[PDB]
Amino acid sequence: SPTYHSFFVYCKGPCHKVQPGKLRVQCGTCRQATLTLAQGPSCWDDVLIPNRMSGECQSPDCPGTRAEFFFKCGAHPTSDKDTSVALNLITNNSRSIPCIACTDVRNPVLVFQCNHRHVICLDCFHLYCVTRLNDRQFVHDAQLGYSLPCVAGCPNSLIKELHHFRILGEEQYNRYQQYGAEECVLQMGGVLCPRPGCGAGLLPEQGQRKVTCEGGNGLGCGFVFCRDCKEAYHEGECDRVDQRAAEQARWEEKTTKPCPRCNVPIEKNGGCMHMKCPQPQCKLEWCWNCGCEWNRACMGDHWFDV
Ligand SMILES: [Zn+2]
Ligand SMILES: [Zn+2]
Ligand SMILES: [Zn+2]
Ligand SMILES: [Zn+2]
Ligand SMILES: [Zn+2]
Ligand SMILES: [Zn+2]
Ligand SMILES: [Zn+2]
Ligand SMILES: [Zn+2]
């Protein structure tokens, strides 16, 4: 069996891309991996929202009870300080839901938070982002920043977790981070350097037709152009969705398994994989997905499932 990954993070290095991640927990007081939970997480809310969960710290002389969750890259060994941000939209495609754009079944996939919960693959999410970025069609939000909604155009589907734009790659992501400053230069009646390589945000004298690509702190490529036609400076004068694919690509379209040791059935209590046999004879703790004994690798790879 290949490893079942519930979690995906963006690793700042050495990976510099999206990788499967490991979920971890520590005492919110002492910041040590000694926080014991009465019952494990079952959803993203349990791990993303501060103080949502509780437990008891096994550390000597620590009264902490706050469960603090963080993620790490799974590609390589990592310090417990080397945390990465969780791309909570990215989902394990257990259900084999087709993509909304290429209609291929891939894993993992990004699931928007609209009502229909449309599904899109990471390669097609990249394309959607780069297009919107080039056509300068990101949506401004009220002090939130620039985001995108579901590719279907659904309402209430803006991505709140802006780090999901890291999946564009460092080049495209840098552009996105600079999106606002570009928009604002233009709103101030400024202009961008016509040279595709440069594209500096310039604020030449109002009225001035002759613009030189130069600016604050050494910025500039030295190109000298006309402000009206964007050509080099001249003396004289100028001269998406498929309706069927979108219905197929919906996240919302097995409930009991026999205990592995004793065989009495158990019903799945939430999204948590940690199964505890209530049967006195047995009392096997096991992983709902893998059917094996409960263990750290399971916690890290898929403590809960979505
Ligand atoms: Zn990494
Ligand atoms: Zn503690
Ligand atoms: Zn949608
Ligand atoms: Zn796709
Ligand atoms: Zn320039
Ligand atoms: Zn001109
Ligand atoms: Zn059992
Ligand atoms: Zn497992």
UniProtKB/Swiss-Prot annotation:
Q: Which domain of life is it from?
A: Eukaryota
Which Gene Ontology cellular-component terms appear in the entry?
A: aggresome; axon; cytoplasm; cytosol; dopaminergic synapse; endoplasmic reticulum; endoplasmic reticulum membrane; glutamatergic synapse
The protein here is known as E3 ubiquitin-protein ligase parkin
**Binding residues for Zn(2+) 1, per the UniProt record?**
C99, C102, C121, C124
Region of interest: SYT11 binding 2: 118-154
Which segments does the record annotate as RING-type zinc fingers? Answer: 2-86, 99-154, 259-290
Residue numbers of Phosphothreonine PTMs: T36, T78
Covered residues, full protein: 141 to 465 of 465
Cross-link (Glycyl lysine isopeptide (Lys-Gly) (interchain with G-Cter in ISG15)), chain numbering: K210, K230
Q: Where is the active site?
A: C272
Its function, per the record, reads: Functions within a multiprotein E3 ubiquitin ligase complex, catalyzing the covalent attachment of ubiquitin moieties onto substrate proteins. Substrates include SYT11 and VDAC1. Other substrates are BCL2, CCNE1, GPR37, RHOT1/MIRO1, MFN1, MFN2, STUB1, SNCAIP, SEPTIN5, TOMM20, USP30, ZNF746, MIRO1 and AIMP2. Mediates monoubiquitination as well as 'Lys-6', 'Lys-11', 'Lys-48'-linked and 'Lys-63'-linked polyubiquitination of substrates depending on the context.
What keywords are assigned to this protein?
Autophagy, Cell projection, Cytoplasm, Endoplasmic reticulum, Isopeptide bond, Membrane, Metal-binding, Mitochondrion, Mitochondrion outer membrane, Nucleus, Phosphoprotein, Repeat, Synapse, Transcription, Transcription regulation, Transferase, Ubl conjugation, Ubl conjugation pathway, Zinc, Zinc-finger
Which annotated residues bind Zn(2+) 3?
C193, C198, C213, C221
* Subunit details: Forms an E3 ubiquitin ligase complex with UBE2L3 or UBE2L6. Mediates 'Lys-63'-linked polyubiquitination by associating with UBE2V1. Part of a SCF-like complex, consisting of PRKN, CUL1 and FBXW7. Interacts with SNCAIP. Binds to the C2A and C2B domains of SYT11. Interacts and regulates the turnover of SEPTIN5. Part of a complex, including STUB1, HSP70 and GPR37. The amount of STUB1 in the complex increases during ER stress. STUB1 promotes the dissociation of HSP70 from PRKN and GPR37, thus facilitating PRKN-mediated GPR37 ubiquitination.
The gene is Prkn
Provide a Gene Ontology MF annotation, just one: actin binding
**One biological process term in Gene Ontology:** positive regulation of mitophagy
Q: Where does Zn(2+) 4 bind?
A: C226, C229, H234, C238
So what family is this one in?
Belongs to the RBR family. Parkin subfamily.
Record note on modification: Auto-ubiquitinates in an E2-dependent manner leading to its own degradation. Also polyubiquitinated by RNF41 for proteasomal degradation.
- Which residues are recorded as binding Zn(2+) 5? C259, C262, C277, C282
Which stretches does the entry tag as region Necessary for PINK1-dependent localization to mitochondria? Answer: 2-98
Reaction(s) the record says it catalyses: [E2 ubiquitin-conjugating enzyme]-S-ubiquitinyl-L-cysteine + [acceptor protein]-L-lysine = [E2 ubiquitin-conjugating enzyme]-L-cysteine + [acceptor protein]-N(6)-ubiquitinyl-L-lysine
Q: In which tissues is it expressed?
A: Largely confined to neuronal elements, including fibers and neuropil. Highly expressed at the forebrain level, in pyramidal cells of layer V, in various cortical regions and cerebellum. Expressed in the nucleus of diagonal band of Broca, nucleus basalis, bed nucleus of the stria terminalis, and olfactory tubercle. Moderate expression is seen in most neurons of the subthalamic nucleus, heart, skeletal muscle and testis. Moderate expression was found in frontal cortex, parietal cortex, cerebellum, heart, skeletal muscle and testis.
Write out the residues that bind Zn(2+) 6: C287, C290, C298, H302
